[PDB]
């Protein structure tokens, strides 16, 4: 099986400017304190690395492929108080639902 993650926060791609120059999705850039963000992968001294904001709710499910994972995550987001714009990344198998840019 493949395990998929649903995140109720933005994923960030960040590089060194202490202070990191981060983008979220198209690409909006902003500067963050390194304390506010959480690594989703190994941190890179040269290029960018994927990060998370400290405040995040996540859940997971096993599925034949992403199309079935979206069934369950849409259900989870209706049963709980979750809304937003959706996004899927196949490299990490992570869905993201965010209500940003409002």
């Amino acid at each position, epitope marked *: 099986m*493949t*395990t998929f993650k649903l995140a109720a926060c933005v994923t960030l791609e960040c590089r060194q400017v*202490e202070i990191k120059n981060c983008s979220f999705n198209q690409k909006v850039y902003a500067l963050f304190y390194r304390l506010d963000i959480v690594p989703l992968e*190994e*941190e*890179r001294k040269g290029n960018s690395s994927k990060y998370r904001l*400290i405040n995040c709710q996540t859940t997971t499910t096993e599925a034949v492929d992403a199309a079935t994972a979206a069934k369950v995550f849409k259900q989870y987001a209706n049963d709980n108080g979750i809304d937003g714009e959706w996004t899927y990344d196949d490299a990490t*198998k992570t869905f993201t639902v965010t209500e940003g840019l409002e």
Partner: antibody
Framework: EVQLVQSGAEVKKPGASMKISCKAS????????LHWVRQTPGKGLEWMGR????????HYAQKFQDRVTITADTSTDTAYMEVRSLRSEDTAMYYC??????????????????????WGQGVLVTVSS | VFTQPHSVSGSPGQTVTISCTRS????????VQWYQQRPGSAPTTLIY?????PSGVPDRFSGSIDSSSNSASLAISGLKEDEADYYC??????????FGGTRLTVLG
């Protein structure tokens, strides 16, 4: 808490193969890739490859991309490394290892990502006639 | 390749520095980790992101970057139970990883 528990030592004939294994507990197995590292006796550490347990994605070093195959089972939370066409040179300690995140040493640092934070106990595989 | 001095030595109480020199590029282009392996045991993390100590690692161990030398270095003070192998590590791109190793010998 976090434990990587490896399989027992083996002996193999030249040309044969091995499928070594490594059970994980104490962390969400699908959050961190599991790596494999070899140590020829009297020689240093040498990274073999890795597997990302949430899918089948695996990666290997230039030396080992030919004979080695690393896999992960997320029903048992066990990672396996298979090595075909064994040779006298392959007599080594084989270690599984995994990265882990920590909240850093200071208030300012934040949540860090630490490579090879936990290691398995190692398995000595001898190749001999 | 990462090249380390296969042997380094130091007396009780003193401070000892172990080199880690990159042949292929700048040590400022990837983070350098360090590990300790006591005889007959699995490795343990001592440093990551050039100079950060993991949970439980004493202040006696410190990591360093000398961009002029293109050499990273691990400096261990208060030499002792510190007798072990010591290895540096750094990545190579999105997916690959490179280890250095140094046998740290405590004498006197």
């Amino acid at each position: 808490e976090v434990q990587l528990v490896q399989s027992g030592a083996e002996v193999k004939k030249p040309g044969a193969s091995m499928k070594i294994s490594c059970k994980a507990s104490g962390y969400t197995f699908t959050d961190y890739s599991l790596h494999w590292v070899r140590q020829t006796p009297g020689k240093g550490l040498e990274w073999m490859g890795r597997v990302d347990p949430e899918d089948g994605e695996s990666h290997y070093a230039q030396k080992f991309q030919d004979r080695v195959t690393i896999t992960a089972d997320t029903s048992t939370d066990t990672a396996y490394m298979e090595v075909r066409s064994l040779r006298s040179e392959d007599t080594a300690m084989y270690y599984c290892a995994t990265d882990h995140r920590e909240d850093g040493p200071t208030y300012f640092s934040g949540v860090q990502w630490v490579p090879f934070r936990f290691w398995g106990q190692g398995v000595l595989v001898t190749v001999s006639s | 390749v990462f090249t380390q001095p296969h042997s380094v030595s130091g007396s009780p109480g003193q401070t000892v520095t172990i080199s880690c020199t990159r042949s292929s590029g700048s040590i400022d282009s990837e983070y350098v980790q360090w590990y300790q392996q006591r005889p007959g045991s699995a490795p343990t993390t001592l440093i990551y992101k050039d100079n950060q100590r993991p949970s439980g690692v004493p202040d006696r161990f410190s990591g360093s970057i000398d961009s002029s030398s293109n050499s990273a270095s691990l400096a261990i003070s208060g030499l002792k139970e510190d007798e072990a192998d010591y290895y540096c590590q750094s990545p190579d791109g999105r997916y690959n990883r490179v280890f250095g190793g140094t046998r740290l010998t405590v004498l006197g």
